[PDB]
Design a protein around this ligand. Structure first.
Ligand SMILES: Nc1nc2c(ncn2[C@@H]2O[C@H](COP(=O)(O)OP(=O)(O)OP(=O)(O)O)[C@@H](O)[C@H]2O)c(=O)[nH]1
Ligand SMILES: Nc1nc2c(ncn2[C@@H]2O[C@H](COP(=O)(O)OP(=O)(O)OP(=O)(O)O)[C@@H](O)[C@H]2O)c(=O)[nH]1
Ligand SMILES: CC(C)(C)c1nc[nH]c1/C=c1\[nH]c(=O)/c(=C/c2cc(F)ccc2F)[nH]c1=O
Ligand SMILES: [Ca+2]
Ligand SMILES: [Mg+2]
Ligand SMILES: [Mg+2]
Lengths: 421, 57, 440
């Protein structure tokens, strides 16, 4: 288990993927043509996870770039690492979606979906040992929201024993004011709960709040939000991308992180946005959470923490014990030793020492409730349903998507109220 | 009696193993059969959505 | 003859194999290429060291061992490492996809694809033997392969080889060096399903070994490299009786007779001395009396428990190096009066002793000091049930909420197997309780 197949769906998905691929190409010492120009062996030792080896020692992303809107094809090909992608792997539709989930999922995206699956199959057939898939997308759009969750369910059919991960971008009124985004997210969540092994809740509310209050910018662009997401996505992929004695693939990690199949919605975090005790306090602090929830309003089922840079491992051990002791009530007692840590020699570009955070907390319900409130404001008065019932859907399915998300919250609450004795 | 009981241990180990390995293959197949059938239930629902668009025009 | 076939399953088994084999090579003057200049009989022989090494007509001394793992990366570093020429390629067996810290994948799903091959490769080593004694199985409790594939292998080895003896070197988990939250499940499942099929099992608590490398070797944060080098010395002390010629040498099977009072009670506590750095060992010779006394200091044990709040059923002292019976007897008399050594009423209290004259060796550029003499105590104490208890509690906490159970059920297992295994462990704990109680 080495090769992962990346899929970027929609405008959100393609831009955060573009930034993801820029950072990791830089870390691995790969230029926009696709040649190795570094120095360390460690940059090549697990290169095969994200890159195919073409003729003339060419390293090419295992990326599948998908949208119903053209133009997003131009911006990615014009961008800093547009040349490095495989031309055939661009699979772009005709007339777009226009922030509509029933178009992306059931009708217009369903037409393009087979031409995507062809590229997926072509990539996966070459893999010596395919481990899983990662999808970068938003849940507020149409294509990445709807066609993305169709691709998930369709990839599950042909690869039921591969891992399916998502970097699912949660919509927010502060970043984008499009009125139906609460409908799209709730419909997506109804799919993700059933069909993914772990979903990273990259939340646009938290990214807005961090960019405003920590990074000091008065009204932030999408580029400001992406510098944080690309830092997170670089951090959470460091386990697989680099050596270090750690010997884990997508399944091992999902086995140790996901104690209940439906409860696979993580709360990311990064630090800094410096000494080891500071990092360790910063990453566990609610200000550094890329999802807008407070750990102190619930409990951690599990936590993964990855550190990067030259630092004392004895110090890291002492510090992770320190916060577990000091914050003992905020980790469920009935899963022992549920906070694990890795350390990576190679720090990221710019920072000498960094620290990425993954947390399966029951406080994630605060994100699913916020969306559920925004949803039920519109649904109870039947607003904007002609967008969805026009394209062929039934009112029943809207009730199921609300019910499934309200169950997920009830289950997150059940285990938060669970006790050992 | 030493032979009888050494054989009995080999016999019941062999059968106990065979029984588990067959039980597991039933279960894993029954798990994967259900997963695919729920996914095939979606493809039948997605065929009713695409028919209720064309049978409303 | 009296051959012994070593099987190394999973990362922890494989890497402890490297440590042991590199160490045996240094102990027997075997070069990395496999040659042994002091061996005058080319192609074969009946010597003590031939219990672990077969010989080729070219003079290569080849480990009687198979390395198994369900993914390549760990066994790749043996194929490319310093002792690549030592092993035939067929001895090193890999799959492509690992068990993912899942006992079910190791025992059923991924495991069943490679099991017939593994037995075939063990069979080629077994038909090289003129008087096969048994198998030593090295593995972790916590890994998916270490737990699941080991159990499967052991079940099959009982079929194919009958009652032929099977020893375990089982790595007991510790959260300091482990990234696996589900190890408690894997441990209880493998322990349950192996119990009938193992004759003796020497557990090694990674925390115990971790605390020794910190305290005695002044290693701030020990790696697996540090731990394995220590472990291999303990393993070497235990297998030295099979590998070396001696007047006062006692066979490991003779100790087993004393160590195993009932079939399920086959888990001896190991304790080793001296573990000391080069700086501390300088102008500091440790007598027989000091290292023997160190065996009853619980800081030196391979498993964290307290013998002093428990009961002894056996006590074996495996000495190596410059040691003579006179000094050992003197030391034991001193210990009997000064220390908490309480036997059960149904056993005899005499300490059993074996002495190997070949002194202990150290891996070049290690942490251990080269000492003139060393000792490994193998004792059968009810205290070792504490290890079961600590682990059985971690199991219960997660299983009450069925945490992680879907990952096992998804790969074909039932809840019946979980509780069946826990009930077997509940009985094992109750058995260790029962043996301690006085007769009537
Ligand atoms: N964090 C982040 N969010 C983005 C970015 N681009 C768009 N979004 C968010 O994504 C949501 C809308 O989804 P889009 O990705 O634009 O829509 P789509 O999936 O491409 O679907 P269509 O527009 O219907 O083709 C809004 O809430 C935006 O704020 C980005 O670069 N970064
Ligand atoms: N003493 C020691 N323990 C180890 C070593 N490698 C791993 N472990 C421990 O073994 C347990 C994890 O199981 P592994 O043996 O790594 O896993 P595996 O047997 O390869 O099985 P999968 O990887 O799940 O297929 C943890 O408790 C680790 O700390 C080693 O070299 N020495
Ligand atoms: C801290 C460590 C011991 C490495 C750990 N234990 C359980 N999980 C983890 C860490 C991760 N667990 C994950 O599931 C994870 C997800 C992930 C990783 C990739 F490499 C690619 C895509 C992903 F979604 N990324 C992680 O860094
Ligand atoms: Ca010879
Ligand atoms: Mg678009
Ligand atoms: Mg492994």
């Amino acid at each position: 288990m080495r090769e992962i197949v990346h899929i970027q769906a929609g405008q959100c998905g393609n831009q955060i993927g573009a930034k993801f691929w820029e950072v990791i190409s830089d870390e691995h010492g790969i230029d926009p043509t696709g040649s190795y120009h570094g120095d360390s062996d460690l940059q090549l030792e697990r290169i095969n996870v994200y890159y195919n080896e073409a003729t003339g020692n060419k390293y090419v992303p295992r990326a599948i770039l998908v949208d119903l809107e053209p133009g997003t094809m131009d911006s990615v090909r014009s961008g800093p690492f547009g040349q490095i992608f495989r031309p055939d792997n661009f699979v772009f539709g005709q007339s777009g979606a226009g922030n509509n989930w029933a178009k992306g999922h059931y009708t217009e995206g369903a037409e393009l979906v087979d031409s995507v699956l062809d590229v997926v199959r072509k990539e996966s057939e070459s893999c010596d040992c395919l481990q899983g898939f990662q999808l970068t997308h938003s849940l507020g759009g149409g294509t990445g929201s709807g066609m993305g969750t169709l691709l998930i369910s369709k990839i599950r059919e042909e690869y039921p024993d591969r891992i399916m991960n998502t970097f699912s971008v949660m919509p927010s009124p502060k970043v984008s004011d499009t009125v139906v985004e609460p409908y799209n997210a709730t419909l997506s969540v109804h799919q993700l709960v059933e069909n993914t092994d772990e979903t990273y809740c990259i939340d646009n509310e938290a990214l807005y709040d961090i960019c405003f209050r920590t990074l000091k910018l008065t009204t932030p662009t999408y580029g400001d939000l992406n510098h944080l997401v690309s830092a997170t996505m670089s951090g959470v992929t460091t386990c697989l991308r680099f050596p270090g004695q750690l010997n884990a693939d997508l399944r091992k990690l999902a086995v140790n992180m996901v104690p209940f199949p439906r409860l696979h919605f993580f709360m990311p975090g990064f630090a800094p946005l410096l000494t080891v005790p500071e990092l360790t306090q910063q990453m566990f602090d609610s200000k550094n959470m890329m999802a807008a929830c407070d750990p102190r309003h619930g409990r951690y089922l599990t936590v993964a923490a990855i550190f990067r840079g030259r630092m004392s491992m004895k110090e890291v051990d002492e510090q992770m014990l320190n916060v577990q002791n000091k914050n003992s009530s905020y980790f469920v007692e009935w899963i022992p030793n549920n906070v694990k840590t890795a350390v990576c020699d190679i720090p990221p570009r710019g920072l000498k020492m960094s620290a990425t955070f993954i947390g399966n907390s029951t406080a994630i319900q605060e994100l699913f409730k916020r969306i559920s409130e925004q949803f039920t404001a519109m649904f109870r008065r039947k607003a904007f349903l002609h967008w969805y019932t026009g394209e062929g859907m039934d009112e029943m399915e809207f009730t199921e998507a609300e019910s499934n998300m309200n169950d997920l919250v009830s289950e997150y609450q059940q285990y938060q109220d669970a006790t050992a004795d | 009696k030493a032979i009888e009981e050494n054989n009995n241990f080999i016999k019941m180990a062999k059968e106990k193993l065979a029984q588990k390995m067959e039980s597991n293959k039933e279960n894993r197949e029954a798990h994967l059969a259900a997963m695919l059938e729920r996914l095939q239930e979606k493809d039948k629902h997605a065929e009713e959505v695409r028919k209720n668009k064309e049978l409303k025009e | 003859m009296r051959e012994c076939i070593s099987i190394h399953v999973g990362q922890a088994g494989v890497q402890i194999g490297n440590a042991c084999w590199e160490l045996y090579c240094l102990e027997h003057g075997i070069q990395p290429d496999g040659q042994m200049p002091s061996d005058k009989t080319i192609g074969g022989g009946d010597d003590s060291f031939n219990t672990f090494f077969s010989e080729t007509g070219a003079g290569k001394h080849v480990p009687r061992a198979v390395f198994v793992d369900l993914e390549p990366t760990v066994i790749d570093e043996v194929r490319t490492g310093t002792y690549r020429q030592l092993f035939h390629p067929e001895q090193l067996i890999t799959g492509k996809e690992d068990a993912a810290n899942n006992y079910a994948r190791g025992h059923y799903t991924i495991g069943k694809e490679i099991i017939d091959l593994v037995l075939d490769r063990i069979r080629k080593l077994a038909d090289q033997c003129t008087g096969l004694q048994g198998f030593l199985v090295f593995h972790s409790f916590g890994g998916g392969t270490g737990s699941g594939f080991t159990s499967l292998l052991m079940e099959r080895l009982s079929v194919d080889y009958g009652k032929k003896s099977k020893l375990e070197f089982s790595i007991y988990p510790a959260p300091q060096v482990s990234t696996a939250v589900v190890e408690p499940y894997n441990s209880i499942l493998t322990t349950h399903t192996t119990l009938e099929h193992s004759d003796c099992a020497f557990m090694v608590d990674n925390e115990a070994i971790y605390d020794i490398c910190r305290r005695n070797l002044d290693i701030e944060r020990p790696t697996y490299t540090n731990l394995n080098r220590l472990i291999s010395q303990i393993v070497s002390s235990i297998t030295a009786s099979l590998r070396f010629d001696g007047a006062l040498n006692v066979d490991l099977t003779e100790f087993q007779t004393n160590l195993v009072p009932y079939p399920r009670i086959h888990f001896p506590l190991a304790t080793y001395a001296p573990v000391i750095s080069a700086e501390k060992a300088y102008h500091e010779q440790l007598s027989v009396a000091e290292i023997t006394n160190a065996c009853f200091e619980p800081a030196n044990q391979m498993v964290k428990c307290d013998p002093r709040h428990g009961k002894y059923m056996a006590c074996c002292l495996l000495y190596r190096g410059d040691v003579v019976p006179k000094d050992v007897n003197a030391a034991i008399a001193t210990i009997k009066t000064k220390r908490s050594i309480q036997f059960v009423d149904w056993c005899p209290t005499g300490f059993k002793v074996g002495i190997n004259y070949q002194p202990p060796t150290v891996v070049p550029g290690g942490d251990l000091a080269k000492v003139q003499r060393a000792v490994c105590m193998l004792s059968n104490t009810t205290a070792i049930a504490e290890a079961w208890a600590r682990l059985d509690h971690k199991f219960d906490l997660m299983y009450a909420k069925r945490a992680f159970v879907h990952w096992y059920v998804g790969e074909g297992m039932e809840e019946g197997e979980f509780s069946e295994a826990r009930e077997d462990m509940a009985a094992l704990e109750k058995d260790y309780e029962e043996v301690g109680v006085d007769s009537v």
